[PDB]
Write a protein that binds this ligand. Structure first.
Ligand SMILES: Cc1cc2nc3c(=O)[nH]c(=O)nc-3n(C[C@H](O)[C@H](O)[C@H](O)COP(=O)(O)O)c2cc1C
Ligand code: SF4
Ligand code: SF4
Ligand code: SF4
Ligand code: FES
Ligand code: FES
Ligand SMILES: [K+]
Lengths: 213, 431, 263, 44
């Protein structure tokens, strides 16, 4: 939770990091998305690619990004510490992120958070001793109508109950990969119990098109 | 003129795959009218396109509600050597707001076409779609759609056979609500901390990479092709004057069926909740307060919600705002002070820290609110907290500071007896 | 011809286009309060101490960054302007440490002086304060970073004047911290100038620490001889002893900087 | 026929770590040539 770096044996400038040959090809595509003379715009995508390859960002990964893009290392450090999706410490294989902002709180995200802690035997901010799970609270994840919800790595699990999340964790332990999305009965953001709109077949090309086009 | 608004017919809805029950890919999109006669729209020219958006009365759907036609016309000027860019704000970070998420993943081609048509009106060479990093699957869906548009010749070199070149890049964020603010979004694209810029300069003069830019919300951009196809006069036929069009609403909190739904502008708040969201949990009489347009808008109590309309002017007259039209509903079992206190905690975690009144003031307000939740305070501190909020409001670089102060002002305005009651209880229990 | 007319409290002044509101006020002898603004650094606009009312405009503008428009009447003393200054000062001091007696800036501190001149005379902050850990950036500049007010002057000086991009901000919001992130020494031949431009006692001279107070020093304007540039300096003395060396502004030689050897 | 009872957005259940960036690599061949500020970077 700190924003200063202290070198340890496992996180120092000589900790091994380098992009794989495939990831170097992907970097060229990232950098080519921006005008020439403004390579620094690639710091965010490239820094995230380093985390995806490595799981987290040691100081050596941040230094490598600075070198590739020819930006001062401090400017990479500033980005790494500003945006919360960057892990400057190792995280469990499954980063469980529970939304606890008011819309999810109003629909009992506390029960979801308590259910996870009881099952995994850990508190918020901790990693399990097996290093498979890390748990944290996050702010609104943009799925408020599907509250309460969690994000585990790249996926959303929605309309959770204490029973649903415990099943999702059991699948993760088993090595299966649960399907994302609502766990309540509906498919996405439609009202439960029946569509109140979009029931009719949509109009085809040219419907209602003004004259003159 | 209409007296009442609502009951939008399916034939008049713009986001016809809102729930993802039809193919979101190009074939499904075209069968639903997307990418139809885009060439003819492009060959009409930027002035014709800008006229249609002006006539439609469309206003920004990102929260501030600026008249879109006028805003996009800032780009309609001769080039000076620099490229020009459209930046689509898909950061969708306001608590309660999840409308843009459904557009991106279920109707991606509406957004892509909107970039081309919207970018054409500004004379932009490319669109940078900034999507919050947490929306990974939605970003991948959009990337698949963009590849389909490229492969079909609908964008890129000679887009839609129109002789206009246009690219559409997707850049992901890395976890910051402040990156939805238009200038902080630009800074993030440039590889810096998402810290908003002062104005002037304005983005239309100096924006992303220092070039003329327009930042537009996903919903604003995604409705532009339809407005051009069906005309601005069709769009302006919905809602009150200066409150035109349809609107995506998110209804969450203490309702029976929390959902996203498209509905006419100026629909009554009560009808929206009861007709689409299945009513307040425990009945309308169980309603306590509603946040009508995302966490940044002041709450309104049940008495105001009886008759208020959901449009820009009606909610302003009710001392709040339409915002993103994210309706958060709280029934009478809610601890209203805790609910608002949690929102100030959110703003404390999202403040970029750049400027003094929000770096220090929001954190200060957060500490007072936490004491107010427990009642561990004196009533004289309520007026003090009101004054602190007014010292943040209007004195910061960006509107996040305004957005943290307004919810506090809403709580004090309508629930001061509740705050004083909590303090009186604490004093006795701790006497 | 090119100049445009603006008004400072009703007094007409002719200024060139691009002149900021703050510069227009300084044409009639009014110094707008500031913290983040420094005329030799790039504009930042983050402290908000320079907010000032423009007549017939509901929102105060950051005078340091806002270009003045033709016909504006800048009210540098209006009730709206004064309340804006009081509010910003209140936020600046809310987490500031009660350090003045032990802080070397005391007596020549812009936070102290602008608090006296533009702030309220008391506190209504009832909470606990922030405390930040100190950074080690070498043997010349002592950091007591709980005193930092996040004005980013040091960052801008290091990047633009010294051409060293080692200082930055890490974290976010109230926890935003100025420093190097990693353990790293700010050894540049101009490093000591960040002591001068830091408005508070966050960055202080290590050799000078605790030895004197500003009011008791005698100032002798003199010249440097450590090189051939001829930088103008002020020799601070007390009771017959040299206590420190300070830059003396000279636009055509050293401006307001000196080298670390001179210092 | 016509159906309105199934979710037709199941492809993303098979997305993986590098899906987004692999697509960005595919899109690279369709882009127009980028503009240039005229220098390698602001520090040149
Ligand atoms: C803290 C903050 C967060 C914001 N987040 C978003 C957002 O997520 N999406 C959005 O469209 N606008 C957001 N905005 C508003 C934008 O700054 C800007 O007004 C909008 O993108 C303009 O688009 P529009 O005119 O089409 O509505 C935010 C503003 C602030 C101050
Ligand atoms: S108001 Fe807050 S988020 Fe906006 S620029 Fe100031 S510190 Fe940053
Ligand atoms: S910096 Fe100024 S206000 Fe702060 S402790 Fe030192 S003398 Fe006092
Ligand atoms: S250390 Fe001093 S100059 Fe640097 S940001 Fe803090 S107060 Fe400003
Ligand atoms: S409040 Fe939890 S997803 Fe929005
Ligand atoms: S001096 Fe203008 S905002 Fe700091
Ligand atoms: K100092």
């Amino acid at each position: 939770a700190l924003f200063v770096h202290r070198d340890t044996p496992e996180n120092n400038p000589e900790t091994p990091f380098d992009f794989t040959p495939e990831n170097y090809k992907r970097i060229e595509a990232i950098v080519k998305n921006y005008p020439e003379g403004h390579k620094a715009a690639a710091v965010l995508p490239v820094l995230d690619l380093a985390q995806r390859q490595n799981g987290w960002l040691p100081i050596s990964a941040m230094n490598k990004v600075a070198e590739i893009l020819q930006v001062p290392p401090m400017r990479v450090y500033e980005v790494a510490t500003f945006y919360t999706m960057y892990n400057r410490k190792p995280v469990g294989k499954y980063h469980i992120q529970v939304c606890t902002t008011t819309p999810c709180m109003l629909r009992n995200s506390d029960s979801i958070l308590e259910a996870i802690q009881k099952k995994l035997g850990i508190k918020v901010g901790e990693t399990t001793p097996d290093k498979l799970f890390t748990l944290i609270e996050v702010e609104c994840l943009g799925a408020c109508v599907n509250a309460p919800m969690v994000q585990i790595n790249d996926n959303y699990y929605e309309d959770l109950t204490p029973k649903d999340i415990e099943e999702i964790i059991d699948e993760l332990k088993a090595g299966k990969i649960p399907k994302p999305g609502p766990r309540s009965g509906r498919f996405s953001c439609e009202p439960a119990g029946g569509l109140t709109s979009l029931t009719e077949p949509p109009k085809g090309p040219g419907f209602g098109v003004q004259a003159g086009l | 003129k209409k007296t009442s608004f609502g009951s939008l017919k399916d034939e008049d809805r713009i986001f016809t795959n809102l729930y993802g029950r039809h193919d979101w890919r190009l074939k499904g999109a075209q069968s639903r009218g997307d990418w139809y006669k885009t060439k003819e729209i492009l060959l009409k020219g930027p002035d014709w396109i800008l006229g249609e958006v002006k006539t439609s009365g469309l206003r920004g759907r990102g929260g501030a509600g600026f008249p879109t036609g006028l805003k996009w016309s800032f780009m309609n000027k001769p080039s000076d050597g620099r490229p020009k860019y459209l930046v689509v704000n898909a950061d969708e970070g306001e608590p309660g707001t999840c409308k843009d998420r459904e557009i991106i993943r279920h109707d991606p081609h509406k957004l892509v076409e909107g970039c081309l048509v919207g970018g054409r009106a500004m004379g932009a060479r490319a669109a940078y779609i900034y999507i919050r990093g947490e929306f990974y699957n939605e970003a991948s869906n959009l990337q698949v759609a963009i590849r389909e548009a490229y492969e079909a010749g609908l964008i890129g070199k000679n887009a839609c056979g129109s002789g206009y070149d246009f690219d559409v890049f997707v850049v992901r964020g890395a976890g910051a609500y402040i990156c939805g603010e238009e200038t902080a979004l630009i800074e993030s694209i440039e590889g810096k901390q998402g810290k908003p810029r002062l104005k002037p300069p304005f983005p239309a003069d100096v924006g992303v990479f220092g070039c003329p830019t327009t930042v537009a919300n996903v919903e604003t951009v995604a409705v532009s092709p339809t407005i051009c196809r069906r005309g601005g006069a069709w769009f302006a036929s919905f809602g009150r004057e200066r409150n035109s069009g349809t609107k995506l609403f998110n209804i969450s909190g203490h309702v029976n069926n929390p959902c996203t739904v498209e509905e006419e502008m100026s629909v009554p708040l009560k009808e929206l909740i009861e007709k689409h969201a299945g009513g307040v949990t425990g009945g309308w009489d169980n309603l306590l307060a509603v946040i009508p347009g995302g966490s940044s808008t002041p709450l309104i109590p049940k008495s105001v919600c009886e008759t208020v309309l959901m449009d820009f002017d009606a909610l302003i007259q009710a001392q709040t705002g339409l915002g993103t039209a994210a309706v958060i509903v709280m029934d009478r079992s809610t601890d209203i002070v805790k609910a608002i206190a949690r929102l100030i905690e959110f703003y404390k975690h999202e403040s970029c820290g750049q400027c003094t009144p929000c770096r220090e003031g929001v954190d200060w307000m957060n500490k007072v609110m936490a004491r107010f939740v427990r009642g561990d305070a004196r009533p004289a501190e309520i007026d003090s907290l009101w004054e602190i909020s007014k010292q943040i409001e209007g004195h910061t670089i960006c509107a996040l500071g305004d957005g943290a102060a307004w919810p506090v002002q809403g709580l004090i305005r309508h629930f001061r007896p509740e705050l004083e009651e909590r303090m009186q209880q604490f004093a006795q229990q701790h006497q | 011809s090119n100049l445009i007319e603006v008004f400072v409290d009703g007094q007409s002044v002719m200024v060139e286009p691009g002149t900021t509101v703050l510069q227009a006020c300084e044409k009639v002898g009014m110094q707008i309060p500031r913290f983040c603004y420094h005329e030799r650094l790039s504009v930042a606009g983050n402290c908000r101490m320079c907010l000032v009312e423009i007549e017939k405009a509901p929102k105060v503008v950051a005078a340091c960054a806002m270009p003045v428009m033709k016909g504006w009447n800048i009210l540098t003393n209006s009730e709206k302007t004064k309340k804006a200054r009081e509010g910003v000062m209140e936020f600046l001091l809310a987490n500031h440490p009660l350090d003045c007696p032990i802080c070397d800036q005391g007596g020549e501190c812009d936070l102290q002086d602008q608090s006296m001149m533009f702030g309220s005379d008391r506190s209504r902050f009832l909470e606990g304060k922030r405390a930040v850990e100190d950074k080690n950036i070498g043997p010349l500049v002592k950091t007591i970073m709980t005193r930092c007010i996040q004005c980013t002057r040091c960052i801008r000086f290091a990047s633009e004047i010294a051409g060293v991009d080692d200082l930055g901000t890490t974290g976010r919001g109230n926890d935003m911290q100025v420093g190097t992130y990693i353990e790293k020494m700010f050894m540049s031949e101009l490093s000591g100038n960040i002591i001068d431009i830091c408005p508070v006692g966050a960055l202080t001279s290590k050799p000078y620490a605790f030895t004197a107070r500003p009011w008791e020093t005698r100032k002798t304007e003199s010249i440097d001889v450590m090189d051939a540039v001829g930088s103008n300096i002020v020799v601070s003395t007390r009771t017959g002893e040299v206590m420190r060396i300070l830059p003396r502004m000279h636009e055509d030689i050293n401006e307001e900087w000196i080298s670390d050897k001179t210092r | 026929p016509f159906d309105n009872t199934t979710y037709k957005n199941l492809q993303h259940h098979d997305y993986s770590t590098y899906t987004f960036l692999d697509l960005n690599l595919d899109l690279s061949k369709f882009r127009m040539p980028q503009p240039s500020s005229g220098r390698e970077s602001p520090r040149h």
